[PDB]
Design an enzyme around this catalytic site. Structure first.
Site, PDB file in Angstrom:
ATOM      1  N   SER A 211       0.789  -1.747   0.153  1.00 51.17           N
ATOM      2  CA  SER A 211       0.338  -0.433  -0.135  1.00 51.17           C
ATOM      3  C   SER A 211       0.757   1.272  -0.061  1.00 51.17           C
ATOM      4  O   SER A 211       0.148   2.204  -0.514  1.00 51.17           O
ATOM      5  CB  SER A 211      -0.711   0.294   1.110  1.00 51.17           C
ATOM      6  OG  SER A 211      -2.286  -0.896   0.904  1.00 51.17           O
TER       7      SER A 211
ATOM      8  N   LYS B  71       0.013   3.578  -3.269  1.00 52.96           N
ATOM      9  CA  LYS B  71      -1.587   4.617  -3.226  1.00 52.96           C
ATOM     10  C   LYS B  71      -0.831   5.838  -3.096  1.00 52.96           C
ATOM     11  O   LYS B  71      -1.511   6.880  -3.657  1.00 52.96           O
ATOM     12  CB  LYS B  71      -1.640   3.952  -1.417  1.00 52.96           C
ATOM     13  CG  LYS B  71      -2.200   2.807  -2.526  1.00 52.96           C
ATOM     14  CD  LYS B  71      -3.429   2.442  -0.633  1.00 52.96           C
ATOM     15  CE  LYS B  71      -4.024   0.949  -0.737  1.00 52.96           C
ATOM     16  NZ  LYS B  71      -4.339   0.527   0.503  1.00 52.96           N
TER      17      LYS B  71
ATOM     18  N   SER C 231      -5.424   3.602   4.035  1.00 52.30           N
ATOM     19  CA  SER C 231      -5.463   2.482   3.312  1.00 52.30           C
ATOM     20  C   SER C 231      -6.690   2.011   2.370  1.00 52.30           C
ATOM     21  O   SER C 231      -6.301   0.478   2.212  1.00 52.30           O
ATOM     22  CB  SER C 231      -4.880   1.215   3.809  1.00 52.30           C
ATOM     23  OG  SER C 231      -3.328   0.708   3.220  1.00 52.30           O
TER      24      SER C 231
ATOM     25  N   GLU D 213      -5.418  -3.178  -6.824  1.00 48.00           N
ATOM     26  CA  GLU D 213      -5.783  -3.809  -5.618  1.00 48.00           C
ATOM     27  C   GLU D 213      -6.199  -5.838  -6.144  1.00 48.00           C
ATOM     28  O   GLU D 213      -7.450  -5.364  -6.772  1.00 48.00           O
ATOM     29  CB  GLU D 213      -5.815  -3.365  -4.682  1.00 48.00           C
ATOM     30  CG  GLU D 213      -5.344  -1.657  -3.772  1.00 48.00           C
ATOM     31  CD  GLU D 213      -3.860  -2.052  -3.270  1.00 48.00           C
ATOM     32  OE1 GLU D 213      -4.438  -3.444  -2.623  1.00 48.00           O
ATOM     33  OE2 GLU D 213      -3.269  -1.778  -2.454  1.00 48.00           O
TER      34      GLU D 213
ATOM     35  N   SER E 104       0.972  -2.816   3.778  1.00 50.78           N
ATOM     36  CA  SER E 104       1.508  -4.499   4.039  1.00 50.78           C
ATOM     37  C   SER E 104       1.158  -5.600   2.971  1.00 50.78           C
ATOM     38  O   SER E 104       0.043  -5.155   2.096  1.00 50.78           O
ATOM     39  CB  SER E 104       0.806  -4.380   5.547  1.00 50.78           C
ATOM     40  OG  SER E 104      -0.341  -5.258   5.378  1.00 50.78           O
TER      41      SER E 104
END
EC number: 3.5.2.6
Length: 261
Positions: A43, A46, A103, A139, A210
């Site tokens: 993440s 992002k 996130s 994702e 993570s």
């Protein structure tokens, strides 16, 4: 140096692979541990998606207020904010905030779509001089963090330099730059990562990450009180696919770094 020996000892104690890059903007000095090795971004990517949309908004002045529909089919595995607006709309600003501060994975996917796919996020990286960043998937599959897989990876050195340009440099316009900083400072997922190893008086804006293989990441811009800001990237991954997150390793790395500045 003492720091690199302590970081090596921390890594040995953790059983995983640790990547660290610090940039001291005071003298532009760098401290690197496995700085040129590739790590799964998870993440932390992002940030690049948000920054790319911000760059678009320099020309499209009203872009960030463009409403984007959240449909049930858009929801993936982790959608703390998008879940609250299913069958409704969120602005590109709200989605950027959700991707960075909570996130949100659905939010990240909408940013990628706005950019024309993962190639659109990677293109922005190249546009601001980052030839190492590569985003290949959306994702949640970009979090597979398979050892040796170059997809969706970057190096600590490359990410530190880029995060410096985005937050402290002028890769973005002034208003976009300030917006990104404000978003990072208001992150809600980083309390146990780099922040946990730093003085409580220091202001931190970070983006955690993570994934599988116990991958535990955090990238951060640090404003010490009465001092020059710092850029600190900490990437950690482990050999077991089902390993547990080790945010304590990121805090310990930050603490070892702070011991010297």
């Amino acid at each position: 140096s003492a720091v690199q020996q302590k970081l090596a000892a921390l890594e040995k104690s953790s059983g995983g692979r640790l990547g660290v890059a610090l940039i001291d903007t005071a003298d532009n000095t760098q401290v690197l541990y496995r700085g040129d090795e590739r790590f799964p971004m998870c993440s932390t990517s992002k940030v690049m998606a948000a920054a790319a949309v911000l760059k678009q908004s320099e020309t499209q002045k009203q872009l960030l207020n463009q409403p984007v529909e959240i449909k049930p089919a858009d929801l993936v595995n982790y959608n703390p904010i998008a879940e609250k607006h299913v069958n409704g709309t969120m602005t590109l600003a709200e989605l950027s905030a959700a991707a960075l501060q909570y996130s949100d994975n659905t939010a990240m996917n909408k940013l990628i779509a706005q950019l024309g796919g993962p190639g659109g996020v990677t293109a922005f990286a190249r546009a601001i001089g980052d030839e190492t960043f590569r985003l290949d998937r959306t994702e949640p599959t970009l979090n597979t963090a398979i050892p040796g897989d170059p997809r969706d990876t970057t190096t600590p050195r490359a990410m530190a330099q880029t995060l410096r340009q985005l937050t402290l440099g002028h890769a973005l316009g002034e208003t976009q730059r300030a917006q990104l900083v404000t978003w990072l400072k208001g992150n809600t997922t980083g309390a146990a990562s780099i922040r946990a190893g730093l003085p409580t008086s220091w202001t931190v804006g970070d983006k955690t990450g993570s994934g599988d293989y116990g991958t535990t990441n955090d990238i951060a811009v640090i404003w010490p009180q009465g001092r020059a800001p710092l850029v600190l990237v900490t990437y950690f991954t482990q050999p077991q696919q089902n390993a547990e997150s080790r945010r304590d390793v990121l805090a310990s790395a930050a603490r070892i770094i702070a011991e010297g500045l």
